[PDB]
């Protein structure tokens, strides 16, 4: 059962969204071929469109995927559901810029205020135990679900609720609105996995294992799950253009190995 | 067409209100017929102040950005050894940087030249290209990361808060610093009608709850 969203908001990010589709760029994206991963930290892979090679920036491309999704399915997620708990308050420990209480239950407090409205629109679901007073008993339940078969590395999550706090402006619909999809966007897209070096002897064997378990991982991430996607329904917006290079024009090349 | 119920509950509460008076050479006292959610409220009167000079500096700053008469002061004798994926970063958004004052050229083990920088990063920097380095890498990771989104020219009222979110760190910071310190302090004496004024500006900001520093501006006491 789909909900009708008649809200200008939406209607006017949604324009906003149809007017920068790139046209050829999507064509690209649409006939993809995925090749592999180039670089794990910079986030970029390898695919064939034609008999053109292009380096895409995978991170860029599933930010616009993500919100994308958010923007056509919003207010109609289904929910990731979460002896394991998630608190709030104990996410915003990591940061050091949130010294004191004040600042740590200010954004706990704008979050929780419109918590019907995130649980509504964005399937945000906030739970607290206690009285609507205590703050530090505030917390997440469930996440939305953008993509069958994709759940969000939660390594992120910290960064999600610190910047729906202070980066998201809850005095404005149409900001609100599109600042929210922008946070659940950021918090969906994979991982950056940093370069280790495997030659490095001084660095331990569980180092060394969990960085190729995480290079496989966003492999298998990327062919079995993101890339499908993009190509079945990822519009391609002006401003991706640097973020899509060719690489190699294949045809070019058979020349040189013609003759064997 | 439709809109959201609770976005217009948090503006009309503060226009309900009227100045009792200051409180403890530290507070403004106010008070709220149809009170079913909203009585007595204790606003900080350096919170409060610091809030209005804040978005007065941040609607100056991108007014001066949007028209494209925010300047940009000429630097000399300033080159920054920065690494080859670091190039390529500056490289990728010397157009962006254009946008704040932040005028550089990338040579080539390469160097960043920067040609201009606007007057507010020039009193900042103070010769330290140590400091430059870090500020402008920051914002570029923060593009490069998604953590701040690009500044859109295509659109030319102007309403700086639409734009608020693409001021890089090093801006804010400053703005915030200044801000604060233009504003009343604690043990500062208000008469009636200062407070007043000050409530009565308070009321016309687009963000009235909070300070510059995230932390709230007033607190409900009754
Ligand atoms: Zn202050």
């Given at each position: 059962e789909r909900v009708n969203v008649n809200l200008t908001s939406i209607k006017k990010l949604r324009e906003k969204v149809d007017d920068?589709?790139?046209?050829?760029?999507?064509?690209?994206?649409?006939?993809?071929?995925?090749?592999?991963?180039?670089?794990?930290?910079?986030?970029?892979?390898?695919?064939?469109?034609?008999?053109?090679?292009?380096?895409?920036?995978y991170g860029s491309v599933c930010y616009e995927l993500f919100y994308q999704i958010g923007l056509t399915d919003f207010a109609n997620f289904g929910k990731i559901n979460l002896s394991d708990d998630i608190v709030l308050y104990?996410?915003?420990?990591?940061?050091?810029?949130?010294?004191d209480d004040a600042s740590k239950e200010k954004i706990i407090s704008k979050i929780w205020d419109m918590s019907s409205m995130l649980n509504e629109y964005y399937s945000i679901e906030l739970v607290n135990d206690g009285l609507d007073n205590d703050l530090?008993?505030?917390?997440?339940?469930?996440?939305?679900?953008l993509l069958k078969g994709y759940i969000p590395s939660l390594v992120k999550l910290p960064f999600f609720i610190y910047r729906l706090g202070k980066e998201v402006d809850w005095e404005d619909e149409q900001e609100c609105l599109d600042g929210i999809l922008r946070e659940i966007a950021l918090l969906y897209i994979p991982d950056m996995v940093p370069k280790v070096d495997t030659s490095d002897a001084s660095l331990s064997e569980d180092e060394k294992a969990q960085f190729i378990n995480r290079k496989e991982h966003i492999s298998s991430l990327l062919e079995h799950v993101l890339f499908p996607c993009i190509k079945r329904r990822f519009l391609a917006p002006r401003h991706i253009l640097?973020?899509?290079?060719?690489?190699?024009?294949?045809?070019?090349?058979?020349?040189?190995?013609e003759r064997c | 067409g439709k809109t959201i119920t609770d976005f217009s509950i948090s503006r009309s509460v503060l226009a309900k209100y009227e100045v009792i008076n200051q409180v403890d050479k530290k507070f403004i006292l106010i008070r709220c017929q149809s009170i079913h959610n909203c009585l007595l409220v204790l606003v900080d009167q350096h919170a409060c102040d610091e809030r209005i000079r804040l978005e007065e500096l941040f609607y100056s700053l991108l007014t001066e950005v949007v028209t494209g008469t925010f300047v940009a002061r000429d630097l000399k004798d300033c080159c920054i050894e920065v690494d080859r994926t670091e190039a390529d970063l500056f490289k990728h958004y010397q157009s962006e940087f254009k946008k704040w004052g932040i005028g550089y050229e990338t040579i080539e083990?390469?160097?960043?030249?920067?040609?201009?920088?606007?007057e507010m990063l020039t009193s900042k920097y103070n010769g330290d290209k140590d400091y430059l380095k870090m500020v402008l890498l920051q914002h570029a990771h923060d593009l490069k990361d998604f953590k701040k989104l690009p500044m859109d020219?295509?659109?030319?009222?102007?309403?700086?808060?639409?734009?608020?979110?693409?001021?890089?760190?090093?801006?804010?910071?400053?703005?915030?610093?200044?801000?604060?310190?233009?504003?009343?302090?604690?043990?500062?004496?208000?008469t009636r009608q200062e407070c007043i004024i000050l409530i009565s500006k308070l009321s016309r900001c687009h963000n009235p709850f909070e300070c510059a520093h995230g932390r709230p501006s007033m607190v409900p006491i009754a």
């Open positions: 920068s589709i790139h046209r050829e760029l999507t064509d690209i994206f649409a006939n993809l071929n995925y090749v592999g991963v180039v670089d794990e930290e910079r986030r970029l892979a390898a695919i064939q469109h034609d008999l053109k090679l292009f380096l895409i920036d104990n996410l915003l420990s990591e940061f050091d810029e949130l010294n530090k008993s505030v917390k997440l339940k469930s996440l939305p679900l640097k973020d899509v290079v060719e690489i190699a024009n294949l045809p070019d090349l058979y020349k040189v190995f | 083990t390469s160097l960043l030249e920067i040609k201009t920088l606007p020219l295509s659109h030319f009222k102007l309403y700086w808060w639409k734009y608020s979110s693409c001021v890089p760190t090093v801006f804010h910071e400053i703005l915030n610093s200044k801000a604060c310190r233009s504003a009343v302090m604690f043990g500062d004496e208000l």
